[PDB]
Amino acid sequence: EAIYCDDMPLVDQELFLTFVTSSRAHAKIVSIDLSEALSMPGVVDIMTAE
Amino acid sequence: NKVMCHVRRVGGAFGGKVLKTGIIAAVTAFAANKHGRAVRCVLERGEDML
Amino acid sequence: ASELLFYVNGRKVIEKNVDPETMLLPYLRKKLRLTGTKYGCGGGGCGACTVMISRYNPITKRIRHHPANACLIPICSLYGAAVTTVEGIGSTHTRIHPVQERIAKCHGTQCGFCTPGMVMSIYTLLRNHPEPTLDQLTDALGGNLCRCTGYRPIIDACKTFCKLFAEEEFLPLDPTQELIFPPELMIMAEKQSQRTRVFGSERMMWFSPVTLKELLEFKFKYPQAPVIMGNTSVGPEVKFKGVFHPVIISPDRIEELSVVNHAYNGLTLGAGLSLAQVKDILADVVQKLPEEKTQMYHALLKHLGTLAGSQIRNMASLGGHIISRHPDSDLNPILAVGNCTLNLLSKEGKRQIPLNEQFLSKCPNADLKPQEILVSVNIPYSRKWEFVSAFRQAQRQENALAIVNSGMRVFFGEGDGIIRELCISYGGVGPATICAKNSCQKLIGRHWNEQMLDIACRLILNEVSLLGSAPGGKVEFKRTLIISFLFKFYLEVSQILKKMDPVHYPSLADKYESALEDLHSKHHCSTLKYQNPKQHPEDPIGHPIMHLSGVKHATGEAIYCDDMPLVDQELFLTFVTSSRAHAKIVSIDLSEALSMPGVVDIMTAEHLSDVNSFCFFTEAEKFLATDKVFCVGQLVCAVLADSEVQAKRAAKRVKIVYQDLEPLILTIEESIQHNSSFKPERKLEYGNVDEAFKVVDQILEGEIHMGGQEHFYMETQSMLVVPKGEDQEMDVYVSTQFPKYIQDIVASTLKLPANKVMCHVRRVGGAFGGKVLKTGIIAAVTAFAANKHGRAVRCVLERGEDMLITGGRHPYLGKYKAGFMNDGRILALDMEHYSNAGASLDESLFVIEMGLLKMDNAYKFPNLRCRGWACRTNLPSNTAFRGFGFPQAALITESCITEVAAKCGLSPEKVRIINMYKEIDQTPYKQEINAKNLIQCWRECMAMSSYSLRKVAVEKFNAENYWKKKGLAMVPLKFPVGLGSRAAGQAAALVHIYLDGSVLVTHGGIEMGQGVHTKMIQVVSRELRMPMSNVHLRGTSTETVPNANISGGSVVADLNGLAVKDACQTLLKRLEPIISKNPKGTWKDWAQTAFDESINLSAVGYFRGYESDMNWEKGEGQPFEYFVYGAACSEVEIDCLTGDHKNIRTDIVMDVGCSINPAIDIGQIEGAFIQGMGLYTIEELNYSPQGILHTRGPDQYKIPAICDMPTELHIALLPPSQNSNTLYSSKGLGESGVFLGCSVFFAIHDAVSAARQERGLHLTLNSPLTPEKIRMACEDKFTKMIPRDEPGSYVPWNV
Amino acid sequence: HGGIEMGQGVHTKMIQVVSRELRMPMSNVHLRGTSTETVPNANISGGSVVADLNGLAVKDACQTLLKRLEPIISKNPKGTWKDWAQTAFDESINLSAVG
Ligand SMILES: Cc1cc2nc3c(=O)[nH]c(=O)nc-3n(C[C@H](O)[C@H](O)[C@H](O)COP(=O)(O)OP(=O)(O)OC[C@H]3O[C@@H](n4cnc5c(N)ncnc54)[C@H](O)[C@@H]3O)c2cc1C
Ligand SMILES: O=C(c1ccc(OCCN2CCCCC2)cc1)c1c(-c2ccc(O)cc2)sc2cc(O)ccc12
Ligand SMILES: O=C(c1ccc(OCCN2CCCCC2)cc1)c1c(-c2ccc(O)cc2)sc2cc(O)ccc12
Ligand SMILES: Nc1nc2c(c(=O)[nH]1)N[C@H]1C(S)=C(S)[C@@H](COP(=O)(O)O)O[C@H]1N2
Ligand SMILES: Nc1nc2c(c(=O)[nH]1)N[C@H]1C(S)=C(S)[C@@H](COP(=O)(O)O)O[C@H]1N2
Ligand code: MOS
Ligand code: MOS
Ligand code: FES
Ligand code: FES
């Protein structure tokens, strides 16, 4: 019965956020392609540093 | 005075729920304000440890 | 098979397998999450659900915009259309529309619940008319209701599209870059599809034919199915009268039904035309055609424009109006006398029938065949010597159903002046529109003279007879209106005949001519006067700061209690109320209701066991009825279901068997006859009245009755209770005035400590004292449901059940014996106050106390004895109301002063002056008062209003007019302010200063539209010397500020302001060392420095309360802290033949002290005055001999609209004096202006006296002064002629 | 208070403090959680001192309330906390306190 954070009920029309993390320990980011990911089911937005 | 933080309980932290927690909360809140929706962000064990 | 496609706010909406019963208002709020559109009544009368409908006509390639009420729109009728809500035209996170900016910045919002409807009505007009007149804007708002503002600031915002605000800073309107009509809708409209659209469910089938051939086919296959057009007749009867249709036919823009043919003999209007379109067609024809031909259209053009508001006129269809055959129809009686024919059509073929008396009576031989539709209606041109008139009288001028209306027509023989044809039709005098065809037949052959008029009157009275038990009541009033309209029709025809043929007819008497002019003025004017050297510019105290939520009110972004989003798996609760005034509960059958879809639980008194009761004041009382019911509307059952629709359906199949009990008490005199038990008497005694009656020159005994009043908060009772799931914690979100009381009754019902239950209130959409007692009872029952089933539960009441469950203002009976000198000095007064308390007495004994302590008003009665009692009746128990007994008690006193003035032969104003308190004087409770501002308010009101000049002009008018009289009156005001105890006046606050310099403040007060949160931040901005933008407030909660008193008593801003001031001063004392060390620093610098030096930045503010005491045994004490003084002058004109009246001008001067916010305070005077004006005039509650509140037809409750607001309104605030005891020398107003509305009451009393005095009749006018009471007091040949019934020979509709 | 419950039992110790300082059972005290809307400018819940410092702050608020009420308890020493609280409201004594 103890309510932890994720135990809180679904509030109306709430969205979910997950992160794409780095797979390199020290590298240049030469390009990022979101075109496929943006067009997939459920996707509302994808944010970068820009 | 526009932003309020509420915490009932934490399922363990040991110093690991401070800095990066705020970075994720800042990015999550930016998403929530941008799209006028509540946003949930819960990490899996793998991406958490990383 | 079909899908539903339409647009809302520019975005596409697709629904597959739609439920055809779905309505637009719940769809917008719960499906699309657009809660800007509000629920107000659900009958099309209030306009809080006003939206804009856009359609593209592919034939005329034009886009049409028109307003509509979303509560009556089924979404299946929106295919291919575009809806626009408040959120569509602007928002704070996109761009504010000029309409939203101005209605907010002009202070046209208080509680803000009606603002979304106001915005959409104004916005929809500006799209059709970007450069409009004020007449067009006021007409668009005719169906929009507001309980807070008095309409004056909203009209000021409307005027800007043709001081308290900077008009020159408003955003300019740009007719371009407005909302673009969705291009896709234009495309599918161009593809003129012929396919009939089909929607269905288990309960309903919906057919939308788009061709005439398909419409005739569905009319044949489903003959009993209704042809829905505007749903303004079938909609309400489905919602309120339990009507259900399994199959619905709803055609879509069929050209044959919208034909406008300008024929040679007449003109033909299609049945699909809206009443607003017909109004525009007829308004154009009466200009392009000669006047002798446009007689029928002028009469229809007259009753159109008083018919409902702009929203209903744009929804309702012409054919729907004729087929509906409402008895109160304003158009059918005109069409009945005009030789109109109905063009019918069926799969068989064409058919033409006359629109006569038999058709309106639904005789099958003259009705439509089941398989036929009404295509169009022929309305012929009038001939020479043919005249048509239309008359009507309602509770108010517009948006109110007619008590009696009429249509009359004459045709004269050209060469003899003899009546060749005559047809008179009346509405609102029976089940259907009737025609006096027999009396008309007997009048054929006569001439147009007074002798024919007398015969006609006696004839129709015999033919158009009503029983004493006629539904709607007002029987004698209806009888008088029938022959009064005939008299007006006689004078109208007599004048045009004298104009056309002067040698054969006499001239009208000069005093008689005013009866032909109707009372009207859509022109509105107003002036506002207030005060303003070495005060800091950044100090906002005294400046007209806008309401903090003003813009959020206009954009629909303000969150009210029902606007909160759907929490997970929440349930809905609705109540089964009592249908008997006093009866035994024999049995309750829940078996059927429990088995219906969605039903989770149903609770009775036995299911609540030992928590069914609660001790509110003096005794424990039940939430739900046990074995008896003591009034209609008493709570019996609570139905809990998965949805609101399922809960209401289940509640209706609950079976309750009653057995009526005697006695059945309804009136105060009945309560006195049957009460032989002890009743706590309460008395004030000043001087010696028994000895004073021996010296007085004259003595009079009089009494006056006064009806109650419904609060009519635009937001109905609403609450959402949510269990946390831990330790039985309960969060209770309620629209209430008393969060601490909600906490007590909920925790007590759950057997929990107070620390487990928290009540949170952000804002209340109006309350006026009506969201306290019953709100907690509902909240306690909802919370019991929530805890029992582990679910959040929502409870929102509909307007009908809201008016039944909650109480209203206490009706009063005042009885006085006055002893007075010949000069008017009342040296002896023996007063008696009686209050209709309802089923319970706890609230009423406090309103009797306050009535006695304030009945003196502005008068020093040297020898006074007052006494008061509360009386139980089998009616809904009445609650507190704005004024708290003063509008009743002071109206009793002014009625006695008016009666004294009549005996001594002076104006009531001369008697008021000589009886007024001196500058230094003493009250009956032996409190010393300073009445300099009372005398000043009276002096400056006389100068500002030009009373002496107008007094001469009104007497001059009454001398030259017989059937119309003007009236004038001025009343003074002394509203004392005090709660009776010091503990009742304590307040608290909590202020945080965060390290970035920003401030969060909260307090115990509740925002109900009075702007207390705005004033609280005005205080913080001064005390801590920061801009108001640096401080924010979220709401009110028992988790932040505990033990807060009720938000009432005219002191919410006073006490919470002193508490907020206390917290700010505590923080400034702590920070003074830092401020002196860094005086050029910012609040961010000071706050961070305080944190670094370990200085607390949180502080609790607290005020102990004003000193107050009252010893009722001695009748002495010091109960009040200060006194609000003022005076008001009102001028009216009445129609002696109909009871209609027009508020011409009102002037108000008010002692406010030092106004903290003049915009808020002036708005409090306007709203209170208008709310009082309705209390004394048009607002009327009608109960049956069985104790049932009547609510249909002419019995509908009417609050003041725009047409009721005075044409001219001058308001001035007295230059301030010193009041060091109060916050910034201010005075808590907002309850005081209610009594000032009686200045209109006694102005009508003045006009009625002028008619009775001229006619030689030598007066007791009760409140409210309805058109019924005004008309019957103006006795004449007509009132003396009507038939009357013996008093006990019938059971009437009303008591 | 400003402390955070991570499993170390700080809320249990806080109510243990209130139960002693106000001389009332722990069942008469309740805590909901932590919020910046009720207690502002709170430090990090760390450094092995969370119960230490918030305990002294909770103790400070309890002593402020006990000082305000002391005239009322000494007038009715046999009374309950319900009696003392209602009497404080009737005599216009603030029952909220920041520690
Ligand atoms: C708030 C409010 C205020 C009002 N005020 C007034 C007022 O002041 N004065 C006044 O006179 N009236 C007033 N009315 C009544 C209003 O004028 C009528 O309800 C309206 O004109 C009916 O038209 P409708 O299109 O809404 O009908 P619907 O509700 O769509 O239909 C009503 C009936 O008409 C039938 N029908 C419609 N079209 C056809 C057709 N082509 N062929 C056959 N049958 C057809 C339907 O089958 C149904 O039986 C008011 C109504 C409301 C809701
Ligand atoms: O025949 C008349 C008529 C007859 C007598 C009149 O009397 C004129 C005044 N008379 C003078 C003598 C003493 C009594 C009053 C007037 C009109 C017509 C009329 C009339 C109007 C009122 C009324 O009460 C009676 C009749 S109206 C008319 C129209 C016509 O085309 C022809 C005749 C007429
Ligand atoms: O301010 C009061 C009030 C204050 C003291 C009262 O009596 C004190 C005794 N006490 C009452 C509650 C049960 C326990 C005994 C009664 C009402 C008002 C109310 C109240 C407050 C708390 C509560 O638990 C129940 C009702 S309701 C109300 C309506 C008004 O118009 C004015 C004051 C009020
Ligand atoms: N807009 C608005 N103004 C209102 C009311 C209301 O419900 N809505 N209630 C009145 C009542 S009943 C009272 S007692 C006061 C309470 O607030 P105040 O003391 O700050 O004037 O507001 C008055 N003005
Ligand atoms: N169960 C539990 N115990 C815990 C922790 C935790 O996350 N969970 N954190 C530790 C850390 S990092 C600190 S600094 C302290 C903080 O609380 P305290 O000061 O009351 O001991 O709790 C310690 N004990
Ligand atoms: O005092 Mo106003 O809430 S009846
Ligand atoms: O001090 Mo523990 O919060 S790292
Ligand atoms: S007009 Fe529809 S809710 Fe009032
Ligand atoms: S502000 Fe209009 S109803 Fe309250």
Curated annotation (Swiss-Prot), chain B:
Q: Where in the cell is it found?
A: Cytoplasm
Q: In which tissues is it expressed?
A: Abundant in liver, expressed in adipose tissue and at lower levels in lung, skeletal muscle, pancreas. In contrast to mice, no significant gender difference in AOX1 expression level (at protein level).
Q: What induces it?
A: In liver, is down-regulated by adiponectin and by the PPARA agonist, fenofibric acid.
Q: What is the effect of changing R9C?
A: Decreases homodimerization but nearly no effect on kinetic parameters
- Which positions bind Mo-molybdopterin? A13, F14
Coiled-coil ranges from the UniProt annotation:
none
Described purpose of this protein according to its UniProt entry: Oxidase with broad substrate specificity, oxidizing aromatic azaheterocycles, such as N1-methylnicotinamide, N-methylphthalazinium and phthalazine, as well as aldehydes, such as benzaldehyde, retinal, pyridoxal, and vanillin. Plays a key role in the metabolism of xenobiotics and drugs containing aromatic azaheterocyclic substituents. Participates in the bioactivation of prodrugs such as famciclovir, catalyzing the oxidation step from 6-deoxypenciclovir to penciclovir, which is a potent antiviral agent. Is probably involved in the regulation of reactive oxygen species homeostasis.
Q: How does it assemble?
A: Homodimer.
Misc: AOX genes evolved from a xanthine oxidoreductase ancestral precursor via a series of gene duplication and suppression/deletion events. Different animal species contain a different complement of AOX genes encoding an equivalent number of AOX isoenzymes. In mammals, the two extremes are represented by certain rodents such as mice and rats, which are endowed with 4 AOX genes, and by humans, whose genome is characterized by a single active gene.
Similarity section:
Belongs to the xanthine dehydrogenase family.
Q: Which named protein is this?
A: Aldehyde oxidase
This chain is encoded by the gene named: AOX1
From Swiss-Prot, chain C:
Phosphoserine-modified residues are S1029
Where found? Cytoplasm
UniProt binding sites for Mo-molybdopterin = Q110, C148, A767, F768, M1008, G1049, S1050, V1051, V1052, Q1164, L1229
Outcome when changing R763C: Decreases homodimerization but nearly no effect on kinetic parameters
Keyword check for rRNA-binding: no
* Expression induction or repression: In liver, is down-regulated by adiponectin and by the PPARA agonist, fenofibric acid.
Query: Record's family?
Result: Belongs to the xanthine dehydrogenase family.
The organism is: Homo sapiens (Human)
Q: How is the cofactor bound?
A: Binds 2 [2Fe-2S] clusters per subunit. Binds 1 FAD per subunit.
Q: Name one GO molecular function term.
A: protein homodimerization activity
Primary gene name: AOX1
Q: What is the effect of changing S1232L?
A: No effect on dimerization; no effect on oxidase activity
Its name, as the record gives it, is Aldehyde oxidase
Which tissues show it?
Abundant in liver, expressed in adipose tissue and at lower levels in lung, skeletal muscle, pancreas. In contrast to mice, no significant gender difference in AOX1 expression level (at protein level).
Question: What EC number(s) does this enzyme carry?
Answer: 1.2.3.1, 1.17.3.-
Q: Which GO terms describe its cellular component?
A: cytosol; extracellular exosome; intercellular bridge; microtubule cytoskeleton; nuclear body
**What UniProt keywords apply to this chain's record, in alphabetical order?**
2Fe-2S, Cytoplasm, FAD, Flavoprotein, Iron, Iron-sulfur, Lipid metabolism, Metal-binding, Molybdenum, Oxidoreductase, Phosphoprotein
